[PDB]
Design a protein around this ligand. Structure first.
Ligand SMILES: [Ca+2]
Ligand SMILES: [Ca+2]
Lengths: 193, 193
């Protein structure tokens, strides 16, 4: 009947990952920026950027999606020293966004992994899950996840969703520019607020 | 409207975990049994047993749920030697089931982790998710997961679901006996088939 896998995938993504990772994020980014400012006179944005390609195409390397999205460094962990608070090994990567080979921006960036599940499901024949179903569930994942963060205790403030449909008329996208767009708007806000 | 997180949680559990772990399971259990037979003259069942406590109570140690469910050993990995096939570090534990301090059975056993998500959601007030909602979604998780394995290419044959509601009239359960029940029925089948 009313089957919507995106509901559980979004809730699970929030409860089992974002809720755990986001509280400590700002401090880990600050404590890295004290050095990144000193070294390269740059600054890493404080929000986790989440890629949500509506086509559910998740590469295992970001740079293969865009040579202007370049791995810079690993974001180090939290400092409390037993169990965690919820500091375990989650790897978070910092990327520099390029324009003409020059650095135009810098952020912690990653794909929302539950879209891989939607892709794998569309390739699993016994699921009866078409590419049109997949797209519909991708959009519903985004909207569900958005609603969740709207009522979340500044988990909202800790991350930014970047959903995008790509040309099937098949110009190339610029993911780096889409991301750069968000980073610049974010800085505008932080400085006019 | 029709909100059912259990659908995505079950699909995600199957696609992102069970589908990957189950194909190699029998061989890893055989290749361990060649030794376990030789050592203790015992035998580890070939099916992955999945605990689905409908109360969504997942302890981080099985023996705290039952002193008659005792950790025996780690099941070693697959043998192919780069990337995986999908052999990564997933830890699978072998437990001996006890009766009067004696070994009555032996199996790879674990909790279906997505029930933790349902528990965490019931404790998250902004989710508007009651304990009655949680129970309803636990049952729906089980049924959804069952239907999936029914059409699965002997993923069905590789695992066994053990769902249980516990006394709220509050006698104690015996989880070890519930599990032992399944192991004995499984052996009966294997030997009458
Ligand atoms: Ca793509
Ligand atoms: Ca329990």
């Amino acid at each position: 009947g009313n089957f919507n896998v995106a509901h559980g995938l979004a809730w699970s993504y929030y409860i089992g990952y974002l809720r755990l990772i986001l509280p400590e994020l700002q401090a880990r980014i600050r404590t890295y920026n004290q050095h990144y400012n000193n070294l390269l006179r740059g600054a890493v944005s404080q929000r986790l950027y989440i890629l949500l390609p509506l086509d559910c195409g998740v590469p295992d390397n970001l740079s293969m999606a865009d040579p202007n999205i370049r791995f810079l460094d690993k974001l180090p962990q939290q400092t409390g020293d037993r169990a965690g608070i919820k500091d375990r090994v989650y790897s978070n990567s910092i990327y520099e966004l390029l324009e003409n080979g020059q650095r135009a921006g810098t952020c912690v960036l990653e794909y929302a992994t539950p879209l891989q599940t939607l892709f794998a499901m569309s390739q699993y024949s016994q699921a009866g899950f078409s590419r049109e179903d997949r797209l519909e569930q991708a959009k519903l994942f985004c909207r569900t996840l958005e609603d969740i963060l709207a009522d979340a205790p500044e988990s909202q403030n800790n991350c930014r969703l970047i959903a995008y449909q790509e040309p099937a008329d098949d110009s190339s996208f610029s993911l780096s520019q889409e991301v750069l767009r968000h980073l610049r708007q974010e800085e505008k806000e932080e400085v006019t607020v």
